[PDB]
């Protein structure tokens, strides 16, 4: 079961938070109901996976927490099918935490929102300062310094080739055939 550590922390995701939290009553239901011998539960808390949020991944990792690639995370979950944990889950429901120690960063929403603001702000500043220094430069040194700085592009036109066979130099075609073939075949036949 892909249960999250996100239980009304981030918010603004409808019932995602109540859907994943409710998946976690299966641990008590596995003892208190009959179906224990047919299904075993191996509830996995799925941590921060990459592949929106991917920009700030570096930022959050600087806290000494680990985010995962899809590959990494898929390796972790396949870890939960090795015969050792299968025996384990059969004995009693397994609760795996693949969160990468993200549960320890306090105010994860506020700390994420702080990281997005700091990266977006700097991105828009440098965008604005870069374009306002570009229009100033163009005012001072006219459009003539920027039309001679502009390069003419060349767009490819269809050149539909008949694709005749590529004829090698005689030396190369003489190697692939046996040397004894010369004047052996009637070329009329």
């Amino acid at each position: 079961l892909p249960m999250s550590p996100n239980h009304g922390t981030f918010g603004g995701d409808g019932m995602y938070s109540e859907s994943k939290l409710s998946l976690e009553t299966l641990f008590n239901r596995w003892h208190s109901e009959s179906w224990a011998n047919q299904l075993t539960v191996c509830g996995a808390i799925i941590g921060w996976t990459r592949g929106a949020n991917n920009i700030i991944a570096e930022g959050i990792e600087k806290m000494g927490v680990r985010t995962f690639s899809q590959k990494e995370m898929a390796f972790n979950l396949l870890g939960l099918l090795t015969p050792e944990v299968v025996e384990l889950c059969q004995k009693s429901p397994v609760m795996a935490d693949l969160n990468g120690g993200l549960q320890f960063v306090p105010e994860l929403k506020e700390f994420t929102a702080k990281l997005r603001k700091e990266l977006v702000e700097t991105s828009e500043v440098r965008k604005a300062v870069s374009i306002e220094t570009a229009l100033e430069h163009k005012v001072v040194n006219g459009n003539s310094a920027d039309a001679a700085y502009a390069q003419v592009e060349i767009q490819p036109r269809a050149n539909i080739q008949l694709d005749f066979p590529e004829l090698k130099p005689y030396k190369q075609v003489k190697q692939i055939a046996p040397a004894e073939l010369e004047g052996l075949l009637d070329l009329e036949r």
């Binding site: 702000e121 500043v125 604005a128 300062v129 005012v139 006219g142």
Partner: protein, 128 residues
């Protein structure tokens, strides 16, 4: 003086540019002003935030042609309106270059800063 005047040596522009202001309400826009090399500060740490700077700009320009300028001279002190309404010269404008096509300083203050006096007009001019 009507006619044709190949007078590129004897020419000069020495106009007293309007005292523009610029309000520093925000930090992304003081960063824009600080990027401009011409804004020389006496105290380089002076917190400009939440102030009204004014610019005693006066621009001299030599011409090599009837459009392109031969050299640009932008100087003049920069003041800050204090809450007690006694300004002080906290900076200097000093813009120097060769082949100019327009004062960027004045061009800057034209869009980013504002003219002190803005004449308002009528909906309908009164035929006196």
């Amino acid at each position: 003086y009507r006619g044709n005047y190949t007078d590129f040596e004897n020419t000069f522009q020495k106009t007293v540019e309007p005292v523009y202001q610029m309000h520093i309400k925000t930090s992304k826009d003081i960063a824009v002003l600080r990027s401009k090399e011409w804004f020389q500060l006496d105290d380089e740490d002076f917190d400009l935030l939440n102030k009204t700077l004014t610019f005693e700009t006066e621009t001299e320009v030599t011409f090599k042609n009837a459009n392109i300028f031969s050299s640009v001279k932008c100087f003049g002190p920069i003041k800050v309106e204090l809450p007690t309404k006694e300004t002080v010269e906290i900076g200097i404008v000093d813009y120097e270059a060769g082949a100019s096509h327009g004062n960027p300083v004045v061009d800057f203050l034209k869009r980013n800063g504002s003219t002190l006096e803005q004449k308002v007009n009528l909906e309908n001019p009164i035929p006196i």
